Amino acid sequence: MRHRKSGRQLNRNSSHRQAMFRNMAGSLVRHEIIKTTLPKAKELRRVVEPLITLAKTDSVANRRLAFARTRDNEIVAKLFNELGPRFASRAGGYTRILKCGFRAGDNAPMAYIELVDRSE
Amino acid sequence: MIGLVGKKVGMTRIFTEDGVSIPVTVIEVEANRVTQVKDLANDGYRAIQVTTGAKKANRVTKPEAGHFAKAGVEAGRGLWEFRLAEGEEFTVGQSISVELFADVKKVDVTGTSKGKGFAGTVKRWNFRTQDATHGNSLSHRVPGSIGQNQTPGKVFKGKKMAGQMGNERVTVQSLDVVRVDAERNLLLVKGAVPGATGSDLIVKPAVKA
Amino acid sequence: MIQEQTMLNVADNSGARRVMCIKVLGGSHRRYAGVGDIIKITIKEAIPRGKVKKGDVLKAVVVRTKKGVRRPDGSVIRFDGNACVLLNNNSEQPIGTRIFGPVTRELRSEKFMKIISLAPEV
Amino acid sequence: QGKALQDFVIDKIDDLKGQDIIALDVQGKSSITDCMIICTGTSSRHVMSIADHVVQESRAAGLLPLGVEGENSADWIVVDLGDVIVHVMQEESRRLYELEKL
Amino acid sequence: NIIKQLEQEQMKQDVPSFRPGDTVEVKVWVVEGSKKRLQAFEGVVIAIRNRGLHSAFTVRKISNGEGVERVFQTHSPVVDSISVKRRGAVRKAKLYYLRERTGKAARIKERLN
Amino acid sequence: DENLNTLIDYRFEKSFRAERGQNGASRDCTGKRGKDVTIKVPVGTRVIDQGTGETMGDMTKHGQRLLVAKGGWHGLGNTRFKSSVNRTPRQKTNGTPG
Amino acid sequence: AVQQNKPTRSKRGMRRSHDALTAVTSLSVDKTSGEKHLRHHITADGYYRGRKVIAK
RNA sequence: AGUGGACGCAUCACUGGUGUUCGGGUUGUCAUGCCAAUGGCACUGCCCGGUAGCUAAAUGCGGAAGAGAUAAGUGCUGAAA
RNA sequence: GGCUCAUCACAUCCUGGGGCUGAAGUAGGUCCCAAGGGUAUGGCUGUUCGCCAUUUAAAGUGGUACGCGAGCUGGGUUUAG
RNA sequence: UCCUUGUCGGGUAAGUUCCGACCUGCACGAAUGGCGUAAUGAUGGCCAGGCUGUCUCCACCCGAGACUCAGUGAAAUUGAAC
RNA sequence: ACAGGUGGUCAGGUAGAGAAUACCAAGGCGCUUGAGAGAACUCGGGUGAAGGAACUAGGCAAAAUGGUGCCGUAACUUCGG
């Protein structure tokens, strides 16, 4: 009945949600900018930033834990190398959400969720 | 007799020397400062209006700011009163703390219970459902009949039907107080009180003998 | 938490081995039997040489419930298997001679000290 | 209050023809009572009547009895004095139960 | 926070730590008659729930062929002294599996350190 | 009853009418059995029947019940008699007198 | 659950009285470009907060 | 003066249920080059637990006392007489 | 007929009050006032009804087109074998 | 098989069902076959052991609808309706 | 551009008795509306304290056993079961 409950389900089961967020975080890191709907971006911060915090300390154990998520060697390699040192002086708030109107296909509210600086 | 307005913090218990668990409810009560006094001459009934807590200056509207400025007290999170008991006199700006509950030994707690949303018949009026098998089709938790046949031709007022449970101002009576301490502004009362943590509660001495 | 047609164990040497409570006492729409109650049981399994015979319906006192009864300090007395002690019909005196297994102390409030006087465990 | 109460019990139990009195010590074997007193009554009405005497005397001694069992059956009746429990019950049923081994 | 100030003022600060799965001796006060006496209680703990002043632990034995399960609260005046007799070695926080299999074939081992 | 000693309440009301068995009803609704009226008598009474004027029972022990009037037997409706030989079952049997 | 009569003009029209659209009336001008956009929404050309955001 | 049965109200502090968003054990297989270590699928793959929330079987309260006019009834003074 | 939902009347089952009592006290019998509340679970048969067992202070009597299938059930009556 | 819920016993505490004995065969009866019959049966009835949310008594959780928004867009019925 | 029906041929690895079953190879697809809100209620499921058929016409549905090798297997019987 959702009192003090957190985390939407997006009309998908746990397996689809985990698989989506597995690819959701990877698409963010690879391009440093990602454009999805507003509710999707909200749960994105719940998963992508914890991965970034795991990348602040470079260790074999942490990298395996970071590799366990996003199931992608490119993303874990990109972390712990520059994503760590860039944000080493920052505590939280590793991404921001910018609303960008509504889609012409289904009138869903998209949002540009991106890195703080994107180093571009 | 006058009551108090407090805030719900949580539930705990106090252990006695003989080993008895008394589940208590922690009520946090600030200095209840009187903002207005009403009498027969001006309003026709003896009651005094009181406020509790503090509110951010920007959020205080100008009409509310002037009303608080007239009483000489600062802003409060809400406004309540308690009907007088024919003989008690109070002055605007007098601040009332939890010492008034040191001898009541019985309190009434009033608050808005937690809202359960648009609840079903089973949840609202404790309807027990029908059979889930034995040929039953598309009707398990439905209310069923709603009355008679052609001859009334209508559903009576107040029929037990689907609706929200909770989110209503409700009072639970005859609650035993456990401990009063003004040095922490807390009111320990045995039992369970309506409303969730942080909800504003109205506590008054018990009217029941 | 014992209701009608619930099979319980035996806590006395009357002769019964598998008793089943058949009706719960206390009033209208009595929900369940607690830890100390006057319960009515029927005999399904009993030794052929026992003083009680199979099929006789009579009263009993519940002695052990495996859900537990609430202690005054938020504690429950969990067990493994519900049991009774036999009783007479006209009188509430137990028929059994011995009591088997430990017995909760909350039975004192029910004034059933036949069981409490025996069963030295607890 | 250890030794005083049984002596306060033995003297009153013998006043109303309490035959074959045994002073037991169940300290350690049972964790419900400190000691128990076993005695025999001649008749059912004798057991029932003597039960009133011990309760009335106990109520006049300040202490409040914790429970009685005699109800429409005088074969087995007991009363509570707190630490001390006495067993006023018939000889015929005494052989059925244990004696001096509890 | 204001609730937390009351938390440790009544909480006990002398309770020993015991691994879930140890054999524990516990003394419990009982109110009867005029004075309070101690009940000698022995068993193996099968579950610990250590949360605030209401921290609880579940102990179990086999008595007269009957399994008796008991729950305490660590910070209550009812309990007097808790001691550990034999230290067990299990890798499960909860040991509810002791109910099904018999105690004789489910003897625990020594934690050995 | 050991609570009573006299028979003053018997000359004032002399006829005791046991309730008749309820008649049959439609939809095979069988009647209700007549309730048992109990006459409370002080302990120590003898019973003598007109005609066979002997003593049938002695009232010596309190709390034991005696049966002095055997009840009747319920009748049978057409459902109890439904047949295909008659092709119209409409016969009934009256209840026997008590 | 089927009708019995033909509803009149009002019952149809008065039903839509609450389905009318509401104008946003929340046109905001960016302090850098000066083009209209929603509250807390980026501009059409991609400016927000007055800073040089991606603008793609 | 206490203790119960049903009913309603309120709460998660206690005992528990759920808790496919937390941790762990394990079968078959595929994949990450491989060992190790992980992830997907097989009803959450099958199970052991369990935070928060919700919930009762869990625990707190209510059925009042009292006031005014009364039914049947009991009365006082009291003429018609 | 059963499940679910109930409503109304008192010709009141209990609780409440009183009169007579053929009312020593407890326990009763009859009548009057009183509808605020409650008024059972099981074996048998489709059961309404009813028998029996076991409880309660009680397992009330009726109307409501003998309520309630655009709420459920198809056990009975049940077309086609 | 009108008397049949026939009478008695077993099963359950309680059995108009079921199993076994008594014959008063309205309207059993010997190829429109009679009596038993192992095995077989998505066949009718009854009982026992395990099992369980069938129920006492429901609560929570996971998904598709239900709900809001965007796009498309039906029907039974309709003498007129304040 | 329909959850239906339509004959033949080719028939990989792992575990398996296998053309069942779970994963994968080549190959083909995500089934032509979606984004959210996480209410009653319905459908398909998962789990459950205590009881274990007390619900019902009826264990209807659910729940439960389920494999290999060894020991052992009653009444009856056409000697096969």
From Swiss-Prot, chain B:
Single GO BP term: cytoplasmic translation
Pfam families in the record: Ribosomal_L3
Modification after translation (UniProt): Methylated by PrmB.
Top-level taxon of the source organism: Bacteria
GO cellular component: cytoplasm; cytosol; cytosolic large ribosomal subunit
Gene3D superfamilies hit by this protein: 3.30.160.810, Translation factors
Alphabetical UniProt keywords: Methylation, Ribonucleoprotein, Ribosomal protein, RNA-binding, rRNA-binding
Residues bearing PTM N5-methylglutamine: 150
InterPro entries in the cross-refs: Ribosomal_uL3 (IPR000597), Ribosomal_uL3_bac/org-type (IPR019927), Ribosomal_uL3_CS (IPR019926), Transl_B-barrel_sf (IPR009000)
GO molecular-function terms, A-Z: rRNA binding; structural constituent of ribosome
UniProt family annotation: Belongs to the universal ribosomal protein uL3 family.
Subunit: Part of the 50S ribosomal subunit. Forms a cluster with proteins L14 and L19. In pull-down experiments interacts with CedA.
Function: One of two assembly initiator proteins, it binds directly near the 3'-end of the 23S rRNA, where it nucleates assembly of the 50S subunit.
Name of the molecule in the record: Large ribosomal subunit protein uL3
Organism annotation: Escherichia coli (strain K12)
Curated annotation (Swiss-Prot), chain D:
Superkingdom of origin organism: Bacteria
Gene Ontology BP annotations: cytosolic ribosome assembly; negative regulation of ribosome biogenesis; negative regulation of translation
Keywords: Cytoplasm, Repressor, Ribosome biogenesis, Translation regulation
Pfam families referenced in this protein's UniProt entry, alphabetically: RsfS
Summary of the knockout phenotype: Cell viability is dramatically reduced in stationary phase, cells have a 10 hour growth block upon transition from rich to poor medium. Protein translation in stationary phase is derepressed.
GO molecular function per UniProt: ribosomal large subunit binding
Positions in coiled-coil regions: none
GO annotations of cellular component type: cytosol
UniProt entry tagged with the keyword Repressor: yes
Cellular localization per UniProt: Cytoplasm
InterPro entries: Iojap/RsfS/C7orf30, NT_sf
Principal location: cytoplasm
UniProt record similarity statement: Belongs to the Iojap/RsfS family.
Subunit details: Interacts with ribosomal protein uL14 (rplN). In pre-50S ribosomal subunits interacts with uL14 (rplN), bL19 (rplS) and ObgE.
Function of the molecule: Functions as a ribosomal silencing factor. Interacts with ribosomal protein uL14 (rplN), blocking formation of intersubunit bridge B8. Prevents association of the 30S and 50S ribosomal subunits and the formation of functional ribosomes, thus repressing translation.
UniProt xrefs under PANTHER family: IOJAP SUPERFAMILY ORTHOLOG, MITOCHONDRIAL ASSEMBLY OF RIBOSOMAL LARGE SUBUNIT PROTEIN 1
Full protein name: Ribosomal silencing factor RsfS
Protein encoded by which gene: rsfS
Curated annotation (Swiss-Prot), chain E:
An example molecular function term from Gene Ontology annotations: large ribosomal subunit rRNA binding
GO cellular component, one term: cytoplasm
Keyword terms of this UniProt record: Ribonucleoprotein, Ribosomal protein, RNA-binding, rRNA-binding
SUPFAM superfamilies assigned to the protein according to its UniProt record, in alphabetical order: Translation proteins SH3-like domain (SSF50104)
Keyword Plastid appears in the UniProt entry: no
Pfam family, one: Ribosomal_L19
PROSITE patterns the record matches: RIBOSOMAL_L19
Single GO BP term: cytoplasmic translation
Induction: Part of the rpsP-rimM-trmD-rplS operon.
InterPro entries documented for this protein: Ribosomal_bL19, Ribosomal_bL19_CS, Ribosomal_bL19_sf, Translation_prot_SH3-like_sf
Quaternary assembly: Part of the 50S ribosomal subunit. Contacts L14. Forms two bridges to the 30S subunit in the 70S ribosome, contacting the 16S rRNA. In pre-50S ribosomal subunits interacts with RsfS, which may inhibit association with the 30S subunit.
Protein family (similarity comment): Belongs to the bacterial ribosomal protein bL19 family.
Known role: This protein is located at the 30S-50S ribosomal subunit interface and may play a role in the structure and function of the aminoacyl-tRNA binding site.
Record-given protein name: Large ribosomal subunit protein bL19
Primary gene name: rplS
Curated annotation (Swiss-Prot), chain G:
Segments for region (Disordered): 1-37
Similarity-based family: Belongs to the bacterial ribosomal protein bL32 family.
GO biological-process terms attached to the record: cytoplasmic translation; response to radiation; response to reactive oxygen species; ribosomal large subunit assembly
Molecular function per GO: structural constituent of ribosome
Phylogenetic placement of the source organism: Bacteria, Pseudomonadati, Pseudomonadota, Gammaproteobacteria, Enterobacterales
Keyword list, A-Z: Ribonucleoprotein, Ribosomal protein
Protein name per Swiss-Prot or TrEMBL: Large ribosomal subunit protein bL32
Organism of origin: Escherichia coli (strain K12)
A GO cellular-component term linked to this record: cytoplasm
HAMAP family according to UniProt: Ribosomal_bL32
Subunit structure: Part of the 50S ribosomal subunit. Contacts L17.
Annotated disulfide bonds: none
InterPro entries (alphabetical): Ribosomal_bL32, Ribosomal_bL32_bact, Ribosomal_zn-bd
